[PDB]
Amino acid sequence: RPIIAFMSDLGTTDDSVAQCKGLMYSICPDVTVVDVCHSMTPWDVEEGARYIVDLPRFFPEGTVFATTTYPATGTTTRSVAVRIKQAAKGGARGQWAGSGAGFERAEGSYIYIAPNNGLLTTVLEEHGYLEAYEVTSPKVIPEQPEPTFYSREMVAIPSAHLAAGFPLSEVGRPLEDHEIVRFNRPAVEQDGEALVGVVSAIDHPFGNVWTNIHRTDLEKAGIGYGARLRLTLDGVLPFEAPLTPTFADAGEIGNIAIYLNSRGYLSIARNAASLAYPYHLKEGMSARVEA
Amino acid sequence: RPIIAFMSDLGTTDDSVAQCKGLMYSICPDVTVVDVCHSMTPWDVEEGARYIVDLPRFFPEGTVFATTTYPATGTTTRSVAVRIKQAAKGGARGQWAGSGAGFERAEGSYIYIAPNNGLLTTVLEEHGYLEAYEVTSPKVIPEQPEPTFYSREMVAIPSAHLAAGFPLSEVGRPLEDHEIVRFNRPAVEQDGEALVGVVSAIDHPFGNVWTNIHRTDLEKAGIGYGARLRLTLDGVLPFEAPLTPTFADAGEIGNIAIYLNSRGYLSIARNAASLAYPYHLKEGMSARVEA
Amino acid sequence: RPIIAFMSDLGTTDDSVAQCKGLMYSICPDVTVVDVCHSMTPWDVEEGARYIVDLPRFFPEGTVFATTTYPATGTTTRSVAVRIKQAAKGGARGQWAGSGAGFERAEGSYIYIAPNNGLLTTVLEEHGYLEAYEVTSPKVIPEQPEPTFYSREMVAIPSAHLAAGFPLSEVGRPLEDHEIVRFNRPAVEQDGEALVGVVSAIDHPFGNVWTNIHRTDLEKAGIGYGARLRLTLDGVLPFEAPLTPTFADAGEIGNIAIYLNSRGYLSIARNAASLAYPYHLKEGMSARVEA
Ligand SMILES: C#Cc1nc(N)c2ncn([C@@H]3O[C@H](CF)[C@@H](O)[C@H]3O)c2n1
Numbered sequence: 001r002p003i004i005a006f007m008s009d010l011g012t013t014d015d016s017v018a019q020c021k022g023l024m025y026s027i028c029p030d031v032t033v034v035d036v037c038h039s040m041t042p043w044d045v046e047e048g049a050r051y052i053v054d055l056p057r058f059f060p061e062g063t064v065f066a067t068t069t070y071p072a073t074g075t076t077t078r079s080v081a082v083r084i085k086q087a088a089k090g091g092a093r094g095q096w097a098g099s100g101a102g103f104e105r106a107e108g109s110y111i112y113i114a115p116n117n118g119l120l121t122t123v124l125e126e127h128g129y130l131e132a133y134e135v136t137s138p139k140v141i142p143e144q145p146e147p148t149f150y151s152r153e154m155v156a157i158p159s160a161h162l163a164a165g166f167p168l169s170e171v172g173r174p175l176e177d178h179e180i181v182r183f184n185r186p187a188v189e190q191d192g193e194a195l196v197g198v199v200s201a202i203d204h205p206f207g208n209v210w211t212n213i214h215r216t217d218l219e220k221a222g223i224g225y226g227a228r229l230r231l232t233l234d235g236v237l238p239f240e241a242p243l244t245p246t247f248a249d250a251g252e253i254g255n256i257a258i259y260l261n262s263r264g265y266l267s268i269a270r271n272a273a274s275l276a277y278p279y280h281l282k283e284g285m286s287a288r289v290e291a
Numbered sequence: 292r293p294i295i296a297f298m299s300d301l302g303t304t305d306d307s308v309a310q311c312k313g314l315m316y317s318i319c320p321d322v323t324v325v326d327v328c329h330s331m332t333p334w335d336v337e338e339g340a341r342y343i344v345d346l347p348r349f350f351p352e353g354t355v356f357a358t359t360t361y362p363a364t365g366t367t368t369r370s371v372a373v374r375i376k377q378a379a380k381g382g383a384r385g386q387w388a389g390s391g392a393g394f395e396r397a398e399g400s401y402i403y404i405a406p407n408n409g410l411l412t413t414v415l416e417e418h419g420y421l422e423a424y425e426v427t428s429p430k431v432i433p434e435q436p437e438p439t440f441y442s443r444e445m446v447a448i449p450s451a452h453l454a455a456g457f458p459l460s461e462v463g464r465p466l467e468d469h470e471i472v473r474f475n476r477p478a479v480e481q482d483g484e485a486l487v488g489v490v491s492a493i494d495h496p497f498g499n500v501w502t503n504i505h506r507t508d509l510e511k512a513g514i515g516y517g518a519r520l521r522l523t524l525d526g527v528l529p530f531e532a533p534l535t536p537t538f539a540d541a542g543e544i545g546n547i548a549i550y551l552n553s554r555g556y557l558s559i560a561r562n563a564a565s566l567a568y569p570y571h572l573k574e575g576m577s578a579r580v581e582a
Numbered sequence: 583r584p585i586i587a588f589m590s591d592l593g594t595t596d597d598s599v600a601q602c603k604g605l606m607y608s609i610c611p612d613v614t615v616v617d618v619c620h621s622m623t624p625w626d627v628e629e630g631a632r633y634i635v636d637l638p639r640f641f642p643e644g645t646v647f648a649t650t651t652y653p654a655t656g657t658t659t660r661s662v663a664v665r666i667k668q669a670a671k672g673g674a675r676g677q678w679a680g681s682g683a684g685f686e687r688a689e690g691s692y693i694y695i696a697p698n699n700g701l702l703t704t705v706l707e708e709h710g711y712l713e714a715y716e717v718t719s720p721k722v723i724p725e726q727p728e729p730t731f732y733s734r735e736m737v738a739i740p741s742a743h744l745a746a747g748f749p750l751s752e753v754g755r756p757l758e759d760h761e762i763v764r765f766n767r768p769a770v771e772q773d774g775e776a777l778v779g780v781v782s783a784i785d786h787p788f789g790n791v792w793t794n795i796h797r798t799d800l801e802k803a804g805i806g807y808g809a810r811l812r813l814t815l816d817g818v819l820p821f822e823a824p825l826t827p828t829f830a831d832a833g834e835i836g837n838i839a840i841y842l843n844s845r846g847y848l849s850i851a852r853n854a855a856s857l858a859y860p861y862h863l864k865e866g867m868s869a870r871v872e873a
Pocket residue numbers: 009010042043068069070071072073148149150151152788790829830851852853854855
């Protein structure tokens with residue numbers, strides 16, 4: 001019944017992840033370990049951030065998220081363990097997840113544990129937190145941590161203790177908000193009637209394009225479903241389409257759909273074809289939208 | 292103890308699959324989720340069909356197969372949930388799976404749930420079915436399904452309710468056989484003493500080549516183990532070898548083996564080397580066999 | 583609760599692994615199956631060896647390691663099942679794994695089951711073994727094993743019986759040490775006061791380079807942390823750096839770190855950048871080190 005959702009940059013090609021898992025079952029034999037993904041670009045905390053920010057509403061209360069890319073492994077840094085506040089609504093409309101009207105989740109029901117290197121920046125933004133600790137107790141980490149494997153020693157091990165009900169406040173000292181490292185999230189700029197941001201992700205394996213322009217950004221510029229839009233990527237690739245709910249509304253196979261993705265962000269795709277791959281579109285390219 | 296075997300086109304590079312899983316453990320905390328694979332070519336229902344058709348005999352009775360590529364996500368379509376009839380025999384001979392003489396499986400012991408887009412075509416062919424329903428009840432799907440994620444909303448969510456014993460007949464109305472979408476399976480043609488079909492799959496990661504020419508097709512043309520065969524791929528590449536049980540019977544490393552694969556289909560490989568990759572062989576190429 | 587750690591060359595792109603798993607839950611419904619990895623280069627027993635040799639100390643006592651690349655599938659060969667002796671200390675220093683001072687593991691607490699094709703060579707070297715059997719009983723393998731799938735029939739099936747407490751000595755006859763196939767581990771040679779070995783692995787996804795030159799080989803040539811080293815790969819690519827504990831000690835991003843990896847072997851990397859990929863370094867290349 002206790003659950004650890006595990007996200008790393010360790011890859012799926014050797015025994016790394018399994019060593020972490022072995023230890024997790026050693027510390028908490030009834031735990032269920034769920035892989036989020038292990039394929040993130042190493043050291044890109046922004047990319048890791050995206051894969052973990054939306055998890056809580058999908059998981060049972062009490063779930064621990066162990067989340068790590070650890071470029072500072074072997075240094076004096078220590079992980080941070082955080083009890084978030086609201087599981088938050090999400091998606092294209094703003095709802096709970098699940099059958100019926102969804103499963104609503106109590107506040108303070110989820111713990112993230114991560115290197116204190118910015119990885120939880122967006123988790124804290126969207127969810128807030130109740131308490132936050134530096135993870136230092138030798139009860140939950142090794143007295144002699146492997147210098148090149150803090151992902152295992154400083155995240156995976158202690159997440160299993162946490163999953164086994166080890167008290168969050170005993171992992172180490174409390175952290176003041178400014179001691180929690182953040183990365184800068186680039187804002188979405190207004191520019192005439194236009195909104196300007198970036199391609200935040202390519203949606204693998206489909207090659208859909210996700211922007212950082214949220215539905216809230218769109219509504220506060222007079223834009224809802226059915227609005228005819230111009231969406232320019234990379235300064236040069238304009239596209240035009242009405243904003244629709246889904247891919248199939250584009251009509252013919254191959255046609256352009258502009259839609260709100262399952263996180264509520266402005267997105268673009270081809271109907272039953274890949275948009276991004278044939279045109280080598282990339283995370284980071286500009287993205288401008290207007291009616 | 293209940294099991295969901297999960298097959299999607301969602302990939303292994305983001306949080307998509309994990310969101311489904313979180314929900315599965317939310318709806319049925321004692322469930323075991325087994326990944327079939329998440330790597331299929333998006334929207335290729337024929338390829339998905341292959342990965343799910345042979346599962347039932349390997350799994351404990353009561354197992355639910357949640358299987359999805361969902362190109363029609365966000366439209367008015369609804370999934371179908373089916374209780375299959377026979378778990379069937381399979382493999383190069385026709386047997387149950389497991390130690391000893393195998394574990395034989397009761398009829399009606401398995402449920403598939405899938406978009407109604409053809410994905411279960413071969414499942415129904417090989418296994419038959421007892422009952423089939425459109426999945427519509429808000430008890431097992433969301434009242435507001437995420438338009439771009441029906442794989443989660445219309446397959447994963449309800450599969451967990453089913454796995455938790457939710458009655459199959461209450462998911463929605465019964466479906467007449469003709470309401471269950473099918474794809475055309477191309478038949479194997481006789482042509483003089485020859486049989487003509489197609490390369491159905493490349494067997495990754497080994498680069499073995501699988502055809503659609505079944506052992507039954509071979510026995511009804513006088514062909515058994517030890518028969519010297521000519522197998523022509525792509526109209527032009529005409530291999531010759533005796534039909535053998537396995538790869539190592541080819542003699543030297545690199546040599547050609549023609550054999551019956553673990554599903555009973557005519558196949559070709561190199562002994563301890565990849566056949567398909569150096570020669571860019573592909574699913575879809577012709578395949579002709581004769582003695 | 584019983585655990586099977588599963589390592590194969592079957593890949594993650596079809597139903598192969600799932601068929602094994604289905605059977606594992608069929609034979610032992612309370613088992614937890616942990617994927618080590620399924621991505622190894624087919625038939626490369628040396629590569630598989632690396633992924634399994636360090637597992638035991640991470641896992642709870644009683645864990646069964648089912649480990650397989652099975653190029654001799656369909657032949658008269660039979661798997662070997664081995665109860666290892668010491669779980670052994672490991673890592674850059676030599677320690678148990680886990681929080682505090684680690685979880686020490688009783689002798690004889692782990693079983694490996696594998697083709698008898700050399701795959702356990704290094705497991706036996708580093709761990710020793712108490713008992714070893716040929717796996718032949720039809721109680722734990724099929725009477726008609728699928729010729730092309732001994733990985734399932736001769737490893738996965740019997741590993742589940744073993745996991746369920748089936749007595750190890752009843753799987754088949756005992757094996758004399760010389761009946762257990764080994765591969766030659768190339769030794770590390772001294773040359774002047776240089777040490778000469780090979781690149782044993784590229785550490786995906788990071789592109790770090792691992793050699794077969796152990797810390798013990800280094801201490802017995804007067805080399806400890808802080809020693810300024812020359813490390814020449816491929817006969818031609820020299821590098822120089824002090825031997826440090828971790829990556830971040832290299833100073834600037836992109837700079838060269840020479841370190842001891844989490845298994846205790848001499849390694850080289852770039853700080854927060856990939857070393858191996860831009861320069862197409864490969865498993866097998868020479869590796870020479872000196873002060
Ligand atoms: C600066 C740098 C740095 N450089 C590397 N070459 C490197 N390779 C692996 N790591 C980190 O080691 C962690 C394992 F704990 C992984 O999560 C990685 O982030 C690395 N960090």
